[PDB]
Design a binder for this molecule. Structure first.
Ligand SMILES: CC(C)(COP(=O)(O)OP(=O)(O)OC[C@H]1O[C@@H](n2cnc3c(N)ncnc32)[C@H](O)[C@@H]1OP(=O)(O)O)[C@@H](O)C(=O)NCCC(=O)NCCS
Ligand SMILES: CC(C)(COP(=O)(O)OP(=O)(O)OC[C@H]1O[C@@H](n2cnc3c(N)ncnc32)[C@H](O)[C@@H]1OP(=O)(O)O)[C@@H](O)C(=O)NCCC(=O)NCCS
Ligand SMILES: NC[C@H]1O[C@H](O[C@H]2[C@H](O)[C@@H](O[C@H]3O[C@H](CO)[C@@H](O)[C@H](N)[C@H]3O)[C@H](N)C[C@@H]2N)[C@H](N)C[C@@H]1O
Lengths: 142, 143
């Protein structure tokens, strides 16, 4: 696993394209050019497991912590390479990398029906319960 | 009325967040004012203030899905004695207005399932918990 460089924007864009296609979710135009800009800056990073898996992490400020709040905005391993520990290794490296940023928390948006992903996340120390209540994510696309 | 907070307003914002956390029996971390002063001054974030009775804290972060950022309404609060009079609605409308200046492609809000009044508020104002026929859950690990 490596932190992506700007030179990796093309492979990151390919993997997100494959991800969204697999899940019948639209593929934005211009992914490679945006990833090249995003990777060049310090409020986000991408981890690559060779060319077959990736984690996209954003950082944003919080008044609760000197460091940022981290969000795992995308986690994906190519279908032929799943169930071999790649995703586990990616997530562990997420924690290691955000720790270098003194991140106070990791947050992940997860669809409720994705029970296999939820089992993976809960196995690795993420929780959806806060004081007996589930935490919900509400959005408005603009 | 509602204004974008300046660095000098950090103390007002910290007070409101303290009151917010005190209302819901949540620990109030130290250094709130000093951190809000830095966040307001330097970071990709902003605070909206309704007088000194309410605020919205919004962060902006990168997205490959569009040119602009994805916005997160990380805190929204109206003092108890001033609720149910449209202040919260006014703050949220101004949130949409300000993030539109940043060409934000999406607004996201984390809401506890048991906060039914807050959920009805967000749902009444164009936010949805449903994506592809499924609820969206927020998973965390505190570090
Ligand atoms: C979820 C995912 C990143 C995990 O990576 P991985 O390399 O397959 O995971 P690991 O080998 O380290 O651990 C296996 C766990 O991953 C989960 N998993 C495996 N395949 C999965 C799949 N198609 N979809 C969802 N979860 C899967 C399971 O929980 C599995 O645990 P199990 O042994 O109890 O069945 C990967 O499977 C994937 O990309 N799935 C589809 C996209 C997705 O769900 N991303 C989650 C972001 S919200
Ligand atoms: C949620 C909140 C920001 C809305 O501000 P507001 O000025 O009361 O809202 P408005 O007057 O514009 O609209 C009224 C709606 O606000 C909601 N509301 C009122 N009091 C509320 C309360 N204690 N908690 C949650 N929502 C409340 C209700 O949905 C109400 O609609 P209703 O008349 O059908 O019951 C404010 O009530 C509040 O600070 N609540 C406690 C903190 C909170 O829950 N924040 C939500 C972030 S997840
Ligand atoms: N079912 C798995 C999904 O994983 C990823 O979404 C990741 C997105 O972060 C989550 O979606 C959120 O993030 C994306 C991108 O910002 C927005 O398009 C979307 N409206 C917003 O809800 C999303 N709800 C879960 C996942 N963590 C894939 N991009 C799509 C795939 O369907």
């Amino acid at each position: 696993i490596r932190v992506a460089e700007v030179a990796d924007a093309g492979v990151v864009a390919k993997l997100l394209r494959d991800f969204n296609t697999e899940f019948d979710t639209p593929v934005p135009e211009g992914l490679e050019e945006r990833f090249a800009q995003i990777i060049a800056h310090d409020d986000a990073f991408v981890l690559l497991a060779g060319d077959i898996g990736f984690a996209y992490v954003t950082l944003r400020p919080s008044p609760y912590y000197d460091g940022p709040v981290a969000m795992l905005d995308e986690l994906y391993v190519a279908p032929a390479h799943r169930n071999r520990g790649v995703g586990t290794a990616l997530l562990q490296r997420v924690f290691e990398e955000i720790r270098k940023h003194s991140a106070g928390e990791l947050q992940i948006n997860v669809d409720e029906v994705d029970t296999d992903a939820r089992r993976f996340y809960e196995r690795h120390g993420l929780t959806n319960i806060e004081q007996g209540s589930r935490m919900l994510l509400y959005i408005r696309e603009l």
